[PDB]
Amino acid sequence: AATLTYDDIVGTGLANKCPTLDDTARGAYPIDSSQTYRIARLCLQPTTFLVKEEPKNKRQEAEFVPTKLVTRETTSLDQIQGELKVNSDGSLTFVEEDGIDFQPVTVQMAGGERIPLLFTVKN
Amino acid sequence: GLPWYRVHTVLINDPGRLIAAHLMHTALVAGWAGSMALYELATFDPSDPVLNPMWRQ
Numbered sequence: 500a501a502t503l504t505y506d507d508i509v510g511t512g513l514a515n516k517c518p519t520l521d522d523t524a525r526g527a528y529p530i531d532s533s534q535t536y537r538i539a540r541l542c543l544q545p546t547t548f549l550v551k552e553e554p555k556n557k558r559q560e561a562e563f564v565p566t567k568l569v570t571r572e573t574t575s576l577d578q579i580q581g582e583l584k585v586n587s588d589g590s591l592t593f594v595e596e597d598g599i600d601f602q603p604v605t606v607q608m609a610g611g612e613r614i615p616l617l618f619t620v621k622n
Numbered sequence: 623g624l625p626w627y628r629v630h631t632v633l634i635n636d637p638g639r640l641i642a643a644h645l646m647h648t649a650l651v652a653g654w655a656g657s658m659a660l661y662e663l664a665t666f667d668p669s670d671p672v673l674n675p676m677w678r679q
């Protein structure tokens with residue numbers, strides 16, 4: 500796509516969205532276990548915040564319920580980088596080193612109770 | 623003059639003012655219902671319809 504500049508994006512809400520890949524991308528990325536790897540950019544874009552209701556009994560199935568975001572398009576984690584290790588069992592382990600890895604978020608429950616959280620993947 | 627308990631008799635032969643008085647009663651009643659609903663909303667806890675429903679409150 501026409502590689503977007505800041506002036507293309509500013510004020511649209513696009514700045515809080517993560518890059519996407521289209522439907523053709525159902526491939527496989529080879530891992531060479533002699534090679535070291537990195538995640539150059541990790542982006543996390545929340546689309547729903549659920550809060551666990553705090554019921555009277557105890558014991559009952561307490562459900563997570565929907566909430567309304569009141570802090571606007573300020574919620575995403577991005578520009579995150581770090582090591583991607585290849586372990587002896589062929590698993591990969593991502594070790595986050597740095598980035599914009601937290602956002603304060605306030606969501607509002609039905610009835611008005613506001614639930615602030617530090618939405619994060621720190622460390 | 624009229625005794626205190628007859629003051630509203632002035633409306634018996636005054637359809638326009640009778641309508642006015644009826645309008646004012648109707649305003650008061652509807653104002654009551656609105657105010658009452660607001661007070662209830664300001665005091666009602668919706669968080670437990672099982673053991674704290676409206677009729678307990």
Ligand code: CLA
Pocket residue numbers: 626627628629630631
């Ligand atoms: C739709 C119902 C209704 C209507 C439109 C009327 C209308 C009238 N009545 Mg009747 N009456 C009613 C029901 C009604 N009555 C009921 C249920 C009773 C039994 C309680 C009476 C007993 C009654 C008597 C004994 C007399 C009247 C009289 C009158 C006339 C003069 C009223 C006046 O000046 O009061 C003026 C009233 C005041 C200045 C203050 C009254 C304060 C009250 C006692 C306490 C507060 C009331 C409160 C604000 C109202 C809350 C609403 C309620 C429904 C919860 C008038 C035609 C009089 C009449 O015939 O005159 C020739 C008369 O002597 N009425």
Ligand code: CLA
Pocket residue numbers: 637640641644645648
């Ligand atoms: C097509 C003819 C017609 C219609 C539709 C009505 C309707 C009504 N009459 Mg009646 N009435 C009529 C002919 C009519 N009347 C005739 C020919 C006479 C002899 C003159 C009367 C004598 C009469 C008296 C003495 C009284 C009524 C009252 C009422 C009202 C009682 C219920 C109320 O207040 O609800 C609550 C109100 C609402 C939910 C709001 C309704 C919205 C209104 C209709 C819009 C108003 C705008 C409109 C252009 C103004 C003209 C209305 C008028 C035709 C009713 C109601 C609106 C009573 C009243 O007015 O009490 C307050 C009352 O005291 N009527």
Ligand code: CLA
Pocket residue numbers: 630647650651654
């Ligand atoms: C079907 C329902 C209904 C009916 C028929 C009435 C009828 C009446 N209302 Mg209304 N009203 C209603 C619903 C009703 N209301 C609702 C839901 C509200 C909102 C709360 C009101 C609010 C309201 C107010 C603010 C006023 C009225 C008044 C009136 C009276 C006007 C005519 C009159 O001069 O009487 C003359 C009065 C009487 C015949 C006496 C009626 C006595 C009642 C029935 C018992 C009172 C108990 C006790 C003595 C009250 C002490 C209260 C105290 C502890 C604070 C009449 C009796 C007016 C009135 O009473 O004017 C003086 C008046 O000021 N009404």
Ligand code: CLA
Pocket residue numbers: 648649651652654655656658659
């Ligand atoms: C204009 C349209 C309108 C609408 C859609 C509503 C809607 C409502 N009102 Mg409101 N309200 C209105 C006007 C309106 N209101 C007006 C003008 C007044 C002032 C008098 C009020 C005063 C009022 C009060 C005091 C309260 C409500 C409440 C409510 C709620 C419950 C209604 C209910 O249970 O009725 C019940 C209706 C009765 C059962 C109707 C009975 C009719 C009798 C039996 C008729 C008899 C005469 C007839 C001629 C007989 C012959 C008929 C023939 C067909 C054979 C509902 C949201 C309630 C609420 O939740 O408040 C927040 C409540 O407490 N409202």
Ligand SMILES: CC1=C(/C=C/C(C)=C/C=C/C(C)=C/C=C/C=C(C)/C=C/C=C(C)/C=C/C2=C(C)CCCC2(C)C)C(C)(C)CCC1
Pocket residue numbers: 649650651652653654657
């Ligand atoms: C003008 C106007 C307006 C506004 C209005 C309003 C704001 C209103 C309100 C209203 C209201 C807010 C009303 C209220 C009412 C109330 C009432 C009317 C009450 C009554 C009471 C009673 C009657 C009582 C009794 C008793 C007692 C006291 C005790 C016990 C016993 C008994 C129950 C008997 C607007 C903006 C819309 C615009 C248009 C015009």
Ligand SMILES: CCCCCCCCCCCCO[C@@H]1O[C@H](CO)[C@@H](O[C@H]2O[C@H](CO)[C@@H](O)[C@H](O)[C@H]2O)[C@H](O)[C@H]1O
Pocket residue numbers: 610611660661663664665
């Ligand atoms: C045209 C009409 C004019 C409008 C004016 C009247 C409106 C009445 C609407 C009532 C609904 C709001 O009702 C009001 O809600 C909030 C939210 O729980 C309550 O608020 C209460 O709880 C919350 C959360 O626990 C606290 O932040 C607050 O300090 C406390 O006061 C109020 O105590 C209540 O009275």
Ligand SMILES: CCCCCCCS[C@@H]1O[C@H](CO)[C@@H](O)[C@H](O)[C@H]1O
Pocket residue numbers: 609610611612663664
């Ligand atoms: C004409 C009514 C205007 C006032 C409406 C007030 C908002 S509505 C109000 O909101 C509160 C907070 O979410 C709730 O706790 C409460 O249950 C609800 O009634």
